[PDB]
Amino acid sequence: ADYSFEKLVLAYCNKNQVRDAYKLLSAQVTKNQLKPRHSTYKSLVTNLLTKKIARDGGFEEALSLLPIMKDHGFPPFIDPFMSYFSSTGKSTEALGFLKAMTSNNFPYISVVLRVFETMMKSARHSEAQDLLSLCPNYIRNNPDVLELFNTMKPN
């Protein structure tokens, strides 16, 4: 049934109904206990993070996918959110993303370092530095984070 669900999700995404596709996938997981393949989750995460869908509240659904996808045993996607944060991501959504991935208030230092590097590589030193205001001291006083903010300076 997983291949059929994958084809159904692709058909709904191709018919401009990604918002309905997320609701259908959530209803099928909660009610009928489907276990979709990783490619379906990849397609849903990639399609929900487009510019028009994300501005209409799609980012909350794409963020809530990660606990649901984590429940089945899948690894959480890190790559597709970087492209969204490099263009129009906000710090309030960034801290929610960095806290919704795991339960111990943050992942390891490498994920936050990758977020800072991705938001620095697109000449955005405002929200990238303001996101450092919302994290505790062990990231703020870490030598690697201060080094990364000292290399890709706005100068």
Next chain:
RNA sequence: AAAAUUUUUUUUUUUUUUUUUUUUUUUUUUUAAAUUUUUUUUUUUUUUUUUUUAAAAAAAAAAAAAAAAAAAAAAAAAAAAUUUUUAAAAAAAAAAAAAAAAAAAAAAAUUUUUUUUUUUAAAAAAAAAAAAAAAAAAAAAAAAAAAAAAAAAAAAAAAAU
């Protein structure tokens, strides 16, 4: 601002694959189909004549069969308001594989239609190969998942203020 990390193990999902099995598709081998008239030329039979080589051909006559050239008629088509010309109508669209173009989303992830080419109009037996499905696993893992573990602080239970 204050107070209220170290090692190792793997699980997903990978990255290729190793082997085995099944199915679809394809290739290979053998197998079901059958108009008339005049002139000229060709072939089987009979006898005679001549020539040639170690056994054949050619010349003449007769009998029988077929094809081509010319004429007439029949049939079919086009032009003008009579003339010319000579194996027949075509079940075909869908499906299958590959390539290109178009539009609308991403722009270099995962959809569509159109156009072009090939095939299907194909059945029994035999054999292998590509794709899909199922399984164990042979090697590299970020982050998630844990344990021991530099933790520390608060509470509870048990042994020797």
